[PDB]
Design a binder for this molecule. Sequence first.
Ligand SMILES: CCCCCCCCCCCCCCCCCC(=O)OC[C@H](COP(=O)(O)OCCN)OC(=O)CCCCCCCCCCCCCCCCC
Lengths: 64, 90, 486, 55
Amino acid sequence: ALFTSLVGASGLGFATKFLSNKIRLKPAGYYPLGYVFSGVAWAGLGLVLHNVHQHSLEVLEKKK
Amino acid sequence: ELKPSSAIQRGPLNKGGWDAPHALHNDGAIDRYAHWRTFYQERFKYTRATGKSTLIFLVAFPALIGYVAYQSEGLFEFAGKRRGESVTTR
Amino acid sequence: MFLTSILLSSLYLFNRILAWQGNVKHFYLFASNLLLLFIVVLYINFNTFSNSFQFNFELFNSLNPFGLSNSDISNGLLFGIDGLSLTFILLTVLLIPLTLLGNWYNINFNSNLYYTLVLAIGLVILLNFWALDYISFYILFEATLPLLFILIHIYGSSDSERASFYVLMFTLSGSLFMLLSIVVISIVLNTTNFINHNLFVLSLDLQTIIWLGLFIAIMVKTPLFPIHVWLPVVHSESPLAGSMILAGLILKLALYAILRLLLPLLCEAQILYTPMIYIISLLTIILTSLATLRQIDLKVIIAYSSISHMGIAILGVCSNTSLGIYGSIVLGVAHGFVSPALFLIVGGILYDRYHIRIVNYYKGLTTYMPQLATYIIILSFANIGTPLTGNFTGEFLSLQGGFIRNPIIGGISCISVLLAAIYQLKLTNKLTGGISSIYMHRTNDVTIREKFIMNILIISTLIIGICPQIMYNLLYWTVNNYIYII
Amino acid sequence: HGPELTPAVPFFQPYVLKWAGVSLGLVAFYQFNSSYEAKNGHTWVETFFHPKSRE
Ligand SMILES: CCCCCCCCCCCCCCCCCC(=O)OC[C@H](COP(=O)(O)OCCN)OC(=O)CCCCCCCCCCCCCCCCC
């Protein structure tokens, strides 16, 4: 499914923003729009990798 | 001219909590005895006694169990039994 | 969308209990306690009539990396149970709130670190027993070791540096050879799987030399004779939780892994080579239960006790007979009860009161702690293998199964009842008797939580000791799934 | 001749109540389920057992 593959990469993005706050000795929610930025960015990476895998599967289907 | 910054104010570390009073008087002789026994391996050396024990329990005793275990392998079949029947296989 | 919403709610509830409350001892207890309510309801819906694996799920499939998958092509990580796999989960989940409880009034410095590490190395050994590939069994066979390293290094007693290095080094050093033998049968069979490998035979020259890589890998984990270097000196400097979860859970894992990995695809490589397993198991029972006698430290004795019982257990597995398999399982479920109770006695209660673990200070425990000297005696006499305790049912059936396969090695190995009585009763009558010691101010009686743990770990031995059949409903397929006597 | 009496102690201490209550509750539960040999033909808690069929 495409949707869980977006939500998981967005969760990886929330983890990036969280851990980057915690290295800088900030609290958890410091700049809470930055979670939206990282979620959209890593979710877009999930879009890209999802579509590349789709097209690769279709190329394998056409070889029969 | 290279010093960590003036903006640190770093302090001392406590572990926090309650000073429990001493329920045990430590004995210096027993303490140094036990510290000698646990870290015994840092001062162990090979002598004739050490070599005799290492020859028996590492070499001769596994070889004796090896002889007994690999020779007497499928001999005994004590499942039912009768009188006069074969007790072994070989 | 629904199961995502459950997670988005539960992480928020966790966040707010982090915010208002300071510790998450209460929410870790609540979560690890709800794990029981979950796994018992999984036990209710368990069909016992089928050898089959009931509850199956793949994680990390190609078509769905973040979650479940239903495809005709599977390269993820399989998970499931039957029987065997389920008794050890039920061993686990009723013990992890007791180690999570076990350091309640103790920690005082970075408690949120400690209970996170303990709960995490308990969840990883849940999913050990759920796993079904050779790699998904192996990627959690050492996800423990990081958190075990840091749980021993910080929070270890004194000289915890060396113990933390040993729990990484020895386990890793024996574990890489397991990785070799997994790589070889993943490039020969092209399947990592616990379902199909009954079907696949191998050449005896191939099957011979991949059994080595798994056997000297479980020689480290259940510490057999050229190993058990590390076992007492990882115990003796561990904290309280990481000693209970070590000796009750990490040791029985290789008892589970000699069943799950070795016996059903190494069927013909073992019958040539069981009488090396009998050599090694006997001279761990003869040797390591004889070095217990001369021990100045008090936690090291219960460590070598764990070695001696795990050396009895793997000559019940490797019997290729039907009583020994069930006997080793009931050893693994009963030693995992009686042994962490003993670690609560040695470094649990007595090290909290007097902070030094030398034996020579400790006598006359009866005159000021009567209702601890009772827990000394009934729990020791449970470790020796008095009947009606569940340790004797296992010791009896495993010595009987090892008597079938080779009777001379069983006759020699029967002396373990004596050798396990010697050191345990020598410790018990040094601690219990005599005039109350000079060095020792009188401290508190054993408190409500350190009785609440103990009576659970005592009733759970006595129920198995009065009826070992309460878990025959699970195991009666796995008594048969591993016999190759044609 | 007096045996030198010790202060007065209640009988039903909390462990008496807890241990006896759980033991007698489990015994009553076992007899309650064994009373369904003719009333239903199977035990009560077997009605909560719903595994999947083997097929
Ligand atoms: C370190 C790398 C290792 C891999 C990463 C670690 C694993 C991450 C956690 C994922 C694994 C467990 C959670 C998700 C799988 C189980 C829950 C689930 O949604 O599936 C239901 C499960 C099986 O699925 P199924 O029976 O086929 O029904 C689904 C029908 N659509 O039906 C069942 O039978 C339930 C089985 C659940 C028991 C799972 C084992 C219990 C231990 C849970 C540990 C989870 C750790 C999470 C830590 C949280 C930290 C934020």
